[PDB]
Design a protein around this motif. Sequence first.
Motif, short mmCIF file in Angstrom:
data_model
loop_
_atom_site.label_atom_id
_atom_site.label_comp_id
_atom_site.label_asym_id
_atom_site.label_seq_id
_atom_site.Cartn_x
_atom_site.Cartn_y
_atom_site.Cartn_z
N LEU A 159 24.14 -35.10 -22.18
CA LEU A 159 25.48 -35.14 -21.60
C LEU A 159 26.55 -34.69 -22.58
CD1 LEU A 159 25.68 -38.29 -19.32
CD2 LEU A 159 25.37 -35.89 -18.73
N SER B 232 36.73 -26.61 -22.30
CA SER B 232 35.57 -27.11 -23.02
C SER B 232 35.54 -26.55 -24.43
CB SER B 232 34.28 -26.75 -22.28
OG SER B 232 34.13 -25.34 -22.20
N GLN B 233 34.70 -27.14 -25.27
CA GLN B 233 34.60 -26.68 -26.65
C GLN B 233 34.10 -25.24 -26.71
OE1 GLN B 233 35.59 -27.86 -29.48
NE2 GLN B 233 34.63 -26.30 -30.77
N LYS B 234 33.17 -24.89 -25.83
CA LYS B 234 32.73 -23.50 -25.74
C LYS B 234 33.89 -22.59 -25.35
CE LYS B 234 30.02 -20.28 -23.05
NZ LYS B 234 29.38 -20.06 -21.73
N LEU C 123 32.39 -33.49 -17.18
CA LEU C 123 31.24 -33.85 -17.99
C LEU C 123 30.75 -35.26 -17.70
CD1 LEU C 123 32.50 -32.43 -21.41
CD2 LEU C 123 31.48 -31.21 -19.49
N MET C 124 31.09 -35.81 -16.53
CA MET C 124 30.66 -37.15 -16.19
C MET C 124 29.15 -37.19 -15.97
SD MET C 124 33.31 -39.32 -13.92
CE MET C 124 33.00 -40.86 -14.78
N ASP C 125 28.58 -38.38 -16.14
CA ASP C 125 27.15 -38.57 -15.91
C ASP C 125 26.80 -38.15 -14.49
OD1 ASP C 125 24.44 -39.62 -16.44
OD2 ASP C 125 25.03 -41.20 -15.03
N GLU C 126 25.74 -37.36 -14.36
CA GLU C 126 25.38 -36.79 -13.07
C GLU C 126 25.13 -37.89 -12.04
OE1 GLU C 126 25.56 -33.87 -11.60
OE2 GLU C 126 25.01 -35.18 -9.93
N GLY C 127 25.67 -37.69 -10.84
CA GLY C 127 25.56 -38.67 -9.78
C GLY C 127 26.59 -39.77 -9.82
N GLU D 224 41.76 -43.67 -8.35
CA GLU D 224 42.49 -44.29 -7.26
C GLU D 224 43.12 -45.62 -7.66
OE1 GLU D 224 39.59 -44.46 -4.17
OE2 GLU D 224 39.99 -42.43 -3.46
N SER E 271 18.99 -40.15 -15.66
CA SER E 271 20.36 -40.15 -15.19
C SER E 271 20.51 -41.09 -13.99
CB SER E 271 20.79 -38.74 -14.80
OG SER E 271 19.99 -38.24 -13.75
N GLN E 272 21.76 -41.34 -13.61
CA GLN E 272 22.02 -42.21 -12.47
C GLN E 272 21.46 -41.61 -11.18
OE1 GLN E 272 23.21 -45.17 -12.76
NE2 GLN E 272 23.94 -45.83 -10.75
N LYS E 273 21.55 -40.29 -11.04
CA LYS E 273 20.94 -39.63 -9.90
C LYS E 273 19.43 -39.86 -9.87
CE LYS E 273 22.25 -35.79 -8.34
NZ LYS E 273 22.36 -36.48 -7.03
N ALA F 287 45.44 -45.19 -1.64
CA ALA F 287 44.01 -44.99 -1.44
C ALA F 287 43.31 -46.30 -1.15
CB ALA F 287 43.40 -44.32 -2.67
N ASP G 124 29.10 -32.10 -24.60
CA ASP G 124 29.95 -31.01 -24.15
C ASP G 124 29.37 -29.66 -24.54
OD1 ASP G 124 31.99 -29.52 -23.12
OD2 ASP G 124 33.50 -30.13 -24.58
N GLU G 125 29.69 -28.65 -23.75
CA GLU G 125 29.22 -27.30 -24.02
C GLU G 125 29.68 -26.85 -25.40
OE1 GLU G 125 27.36 -25.07 -22.61
OE2 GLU G 125 26.93 -25.93 -20.64
N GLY G 126 28.75 -26.27 -26.17
CA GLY G 126 29.05 -25.82 -27.50
C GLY G 126 28.99 -26.89 -28.57
N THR G 127 28.75 -28.14 -28.20
CA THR G 127 28.63 -29.23 -29.15
C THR G 127 27.18 -29.68 -29.24
OG1 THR G 127 30.81 -29.89 -28.32
CG2 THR G 127 29.75 -31.34 -29.91
N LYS H 31 42.00 -48.34 -8.69
CA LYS H 31 41.30 -49.48 -8.13
C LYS H 31 40.63 -50.35 -9.19
CE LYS H 31 39.58 -48.24 -4.44
NZ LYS H 31 38.63 -47.45 -3.61
#
Lengths: 48, 48, 48
Positions: free
Chosen positions: A17, B46-48, B17-21, B29, A46-48, C47, A19-22, B31
């Motif tokens: 996870l 992004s860094q790239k 770049l959040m964790d997938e899913g 919001e 991953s969570q998925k 929301a 960042d791109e380029g890091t 909340k």
Amino acid sequence: VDPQGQRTIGVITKLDLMDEGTDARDVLENKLLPLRRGYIGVVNRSQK
Amino acid sequence: VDPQGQRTIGVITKLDLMDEGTDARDVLENKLLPLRRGYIGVVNRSQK
Amino acid sequence: VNKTVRDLMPKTIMHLMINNTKEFIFSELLANLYSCGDQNTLMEESAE
């Protein structure tokens, strides 16, 4: 709690996870924050 | 240093770049953590 | 003179400040709120 780091082991998660380029080379080679026991890199599900 | 949050603006960065899913919808919001001015999501270069 | 200023400092404040802001709330607030522009955005559905 463990200043000398004799009963401490460091693990780096979420290596997919970053960042791109890091990359975590500087920390996994135990250079950025030198710890005696080294840093083990793991990639869980991953969570998925 | 600002208990009531009169002069506090919350900003949420790195939304691409959040964790997938997963998604920070419950944060953007206003909340999860109630904030007077609310949170503003932004995606930077992004860094790239 | 301390007695007479002590008995008329509260009354002076409230007859001008409190017992007037109360009537402003009960009479004039509705007019200002309804008269300010963009009725559609004065009531934003949150929301939540």
